[PDB]
Ligand binder design. Structure first.
Ligand code: L64
Length: 850
């Protein structure tokens, strides 16, 4: 009974990597209160989700086929191949044809319960969408391939079954907190404590303490009194205790003043605080350190029969005209970039004229940053403002903006909630583009249960794909983030309890696999020095240990975390080789458990341990965004954002791109380089000089995409050790752990392929200057969306600290200039790489000296 639940919770705890029943690290029931809250939205979505479509999770889009995918048209005819057993029959189809409409034309060209499954994958060509609007199809086209499909039985919705779940204002006293003392084990200095009252990163009030000698224990007993009445404390307000050294910041911890029940905080607390190895998302956490045996502590008293916060209640339609030169200043402000700080006057002006600012949704981020949140009366005037959301509600979703209201500068439930309301109108296609961000954006939420959380949860349970990646993006944080694992765990359990028995069995297999393969790598790296190269007594112990796990542990087949349609199966021991890198990665390879697989190409995975893979993920998920932004302007820069998921602490997986070789291995075929080796290698891997020319094309595109991209994200200056290229001309970076500086890697060996030397030009290189600016300006259009993604990436991924760090992308997009001053700028930079050729490429080699 409650024994088939303690084996289930035993199941769920394993899948998660955190025991959501553990209270060994909390001073209230917010995490639990939240486990309980989320039951409804789960159950609503499980309740409402359609069984057939959920099982087939058709991956479609409601976008317009780009100009370029039309030029592969073939006179309004797309050919689709079907296979029942050994059979197969091409079939002309219209792009606007549906799936149903196509079994109709097929049954009569050659008992209604057959769905077109894709050959080799668990991807389904079903439902009421033009087949031109399926992503699997738009893919085969982009890549010039052959839409293979096998007619067979619709998968059973009974497998997606789910187990039924068993389960005032007006106190004028200035607010005080008594700092009793600090206590730490192994600590000769001087040290005080700083008590900030925070709200979305701004300090409402701050009162420090008397410095004192740095011993293992330090008392004070002070009553600390702040300037701020207890009526003006805003819901979400943080009491933030920090501890400085003499000067430098060394410890922090945080406590919500208003709890989840709206009650204020009364009482005695002993808070375990986080140590520091400037803005960072771990500085905002309400979580306390769980390593109570080593971490600094702190004790404090909240005197405060209990005082509680009232949920505002809706209640001035008078209108006056606005001078010209004021509305000039308003509209000027509202136009500026997110990263533009507001002067106190810009603020008084924005707030003063708040009803005219409400008309431009683009002024919402700047305006809700103009609120004295330390002022009970202001704050309400604000609630009454968000009640007049006629224009917001009607506004076309703008994601740059929505995001902005979910970053660290906004900590007010009502604001954030309107951003989320806008997220609702996103088709699942777009949710996947931004899911990682909108999972990271949960770090800036003040309370565990939030509307953002309930949105990730709805959307994830409604579509299986999103589901899958929601699992791994969450499991990735829970495992390497002590500041947020407890919050994310409550959420992931929430999702798991509604995804179906079908996917539990699947995540159970992916995790076990990853669980073993973690093991092998560790064992294997502990035999080779960060110095040592690759031993053959090692190559014997690898194929020893895989031969082993293959001959027992690894299940017949598991789904591929970075690409879940694909089922991998049996190991290709022969191909599996530890790689040369100092951090000793595992080049792996599997056959595809799917009998209907067209090719024999294997599934190629690179288990790495030694570094945090979450920084690769963020960078990639942005490039995938840049592409979709090059699709809305009919542009395709052939990027290769390889799959790369993080699975646990400092270890994850990467996708191996078939038949691709670095630049460096191309050159070393005493650090010199030669130009012709580019082409020589291309022509050698182009059977015909026809395919050779297709290849030189990718190279112009790909090379150009990756130079714009890399320039923007400030990661252009790489070493050819870290650039690669497929046999078919496609160029792309790897390893994102990122004297004379180069804006990006455009070394003379590329130019050569473009057919140029020293200071010349050619039919390709003029093209390449052509495409680049098309691609650059295209981004400049979406400046705001990119700044806010960049900013949020630093704060939730690159321990980022500096506000000047972001003032970068500002300049790199060169804001507030016309499409000319820019196109120059860029093409100026294209040139700087010419005036430098290899000098820097050479230095990444000579570096091994300094
Ligand atoms: O680290 C990180 N993240 C990180 C996060 C946080 N903080 C630090 C680092 N992420 C990462 C690192 C490396 C790779 C990668 N992905 C490959 N793919 C095979 C083809 O589909 C694409 C992937 C290959 C193929 N080869 N490699 C290298 C092996 C080691 N290398 C050499 O031994 C070497 C040296 C000199 C000249 N040639 C080779 C250099 C070449 C690859 N590395 C991928 C991801």
């Amino acid at each position: 009974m409650s024994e088939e639940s303690q084996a289930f919770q035993r199941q769920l705890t394993a899948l998660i990597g955190y025991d959501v029943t553990d209270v060994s690290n909390v001073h209230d029931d917010e995490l639990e209160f939240t486990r309980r809250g989320l039951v409804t939205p789960r159950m609503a979505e499980v309740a409402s989700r359609d069984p057939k479509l959920y099982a087939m999770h058709p991956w479609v889009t409601s976008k317009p086929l780009p100009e370029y995918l039309w030029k592969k048209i073939a006179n309004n005819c797309i050919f689709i191949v079907i296979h029942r057993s050994t059979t197969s029959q091409t079939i002309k189809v219209s792009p606007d044809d549906t799936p149903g409409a196509i079994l109709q034309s097929f049954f009569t060209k050659m008992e209604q319960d057959f769905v077109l499954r894709v050959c080799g994958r668990d991807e389904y060509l079903v439902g009421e969408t033009p087949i031109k609007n399926f992503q699997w199809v738009r893919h085969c086209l982009k890549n010039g391939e052959e839409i293979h499909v096998v007619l067979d039985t619709p998968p059973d919705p009974a497998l997606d079954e789910v187990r039924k779940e068993e389960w005032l204002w007006d106190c004028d006293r200035k607010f005080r907190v008594k700092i009793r003392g600090i206590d730490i084990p192994v600590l000769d200095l001087t040290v005080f404590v700083e008590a900030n009252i925070q709200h979305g990163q701004q300090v409402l009030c701050q009162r420090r303490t008397s410095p004192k000698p740095f011993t293992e224990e330090v008392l004070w007993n002070v009553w600390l009194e702040f300037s701020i009445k207890i009526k003006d404390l805003p819901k979400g307000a943080l009491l933030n205790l920090q501890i400085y050294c003499g000067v430098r910041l060394l410890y922090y911890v945080n406590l919500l003043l208003i709890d989840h029940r709206f009650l204020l905080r009364r009482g005695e607390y002993v808070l375990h605080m986080w140590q520091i190895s400037s803005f960072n998302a771990d500085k905002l956490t309400s979580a306390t350190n769980p390593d109570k045996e080593n971490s600094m502590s702190i004790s404090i008293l909240l005197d405060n029969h209990p005082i509680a916060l009232p949920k505002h209640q809706p209640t001035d339609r008078v209108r006056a005209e606005m001078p010209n030169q004021l509305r000039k200043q308003l509209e000027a402000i509202i136009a500026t970039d997110p990263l533009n700080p507001l002067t106190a006057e810009d603020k008084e002006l924005l707030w003063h004229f708040r009803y005219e600012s409400l008309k431009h949704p683009k002024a919402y981020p700047k305006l809700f940053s103009s609120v004295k949140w330390g002022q009970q009366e202001i704050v309400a005037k604000t609630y009454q403002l968000l009640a007049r959301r006629e224009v917001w509600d009607q506004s076309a979703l703008d994601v740059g903006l929505t995001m902005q209201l979910l970053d660290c500068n906004f900590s007010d439930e009502n604001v954030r909630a309107i951003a989320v309301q806008k997220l609702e109108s996103l088709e699942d296609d777009d949710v996947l583009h931004y899911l990682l961000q909108l999972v990271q954006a949960v770090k800036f939420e003040p309370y565990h249960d939030s509307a953002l959380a309930r949105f990730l949860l709805k959307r994830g349970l409604r579509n299986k794909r999103i589901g899958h990646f929601l699992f791994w993006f969450l499991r990735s944080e829970i495992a390497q983030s002590r500041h947020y694992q407890q919050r994310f765990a409550v959420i992931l359990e929430a999702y798991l309890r509604g995804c179906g028995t079908a996917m539990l069995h699947d995540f159970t297999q992916q995790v076990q696999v990853i669980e073993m393969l973690q093991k092998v790598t560790l064992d294997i790296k502990s035999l080779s020095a960060e110095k040592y190269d690759v031993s053959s007594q090692v190559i014997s112990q690898l194929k020893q240990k895989l031969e082993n796990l293959q001959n027992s542990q690894l299940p017949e087949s598991f789904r591929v975390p970075y690409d879940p349609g694909l089922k991998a199966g049996a190991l290709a021991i022969e191909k599996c080789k530890v790689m040369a890198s100092k951090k000793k990665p595992l080049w792996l390879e599997f056959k595809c458990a799917d009998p209907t697989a067209l090719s024999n190409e294997t599934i190629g995975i690179i288990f790495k341990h030694g570094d945090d893979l979450r920084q690769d993920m963020l960078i990639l998920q942005i490039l995938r965004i840049m592409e979709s932004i090059w699709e809305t302007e009919s542009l395709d820069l052939c990027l290769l954002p390889y799959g790369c998921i993080s699975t646990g602490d400092k270890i994850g997986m990467i996708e191996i791109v078939k038949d691709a070789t670095t630049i460096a291995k191309i050159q070393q075929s005493t650090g010199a380089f030669k130009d012709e080796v580019l082409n020589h290698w291309l022509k050698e891997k182009s059977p015909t000089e026809e395919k050779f020319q297709a290849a030189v094309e990718r190279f112009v595109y790909s090379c150009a995409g990756y130079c714009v991209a890399t320039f923007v994200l400030g990661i252009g200056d790489r070493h050819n050790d870290n650039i690669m290229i497929t046999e078919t001309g496609n160029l792309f970076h790897i390893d994102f752990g990122h004297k004379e500086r180069v804006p990006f890697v455009l070394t003379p060996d590329f130019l050569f392929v473009m057919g140029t030397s020293g200071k010349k030009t050619s039919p390709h290189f003029q093209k390449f200057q052509d495409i680049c600016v098309k691609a650059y300006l295209a981004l400049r259009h979406h400046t705001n969306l990119l700044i806010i993604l960049f900013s949020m990436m630093l704060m939730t991924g690159m321990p980022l600290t500096s506000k000047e760090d972001i003032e970068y992308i500002r300049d790199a997009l060169t804001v507030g200039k016309n499409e000319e001053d820019a196109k120059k700028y860029f093409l100026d930079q294209i040139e700087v790489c010419r005036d430098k050729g290899w000098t820097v490429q050479f230095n990444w080699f000579l570096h091994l000296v300094l």
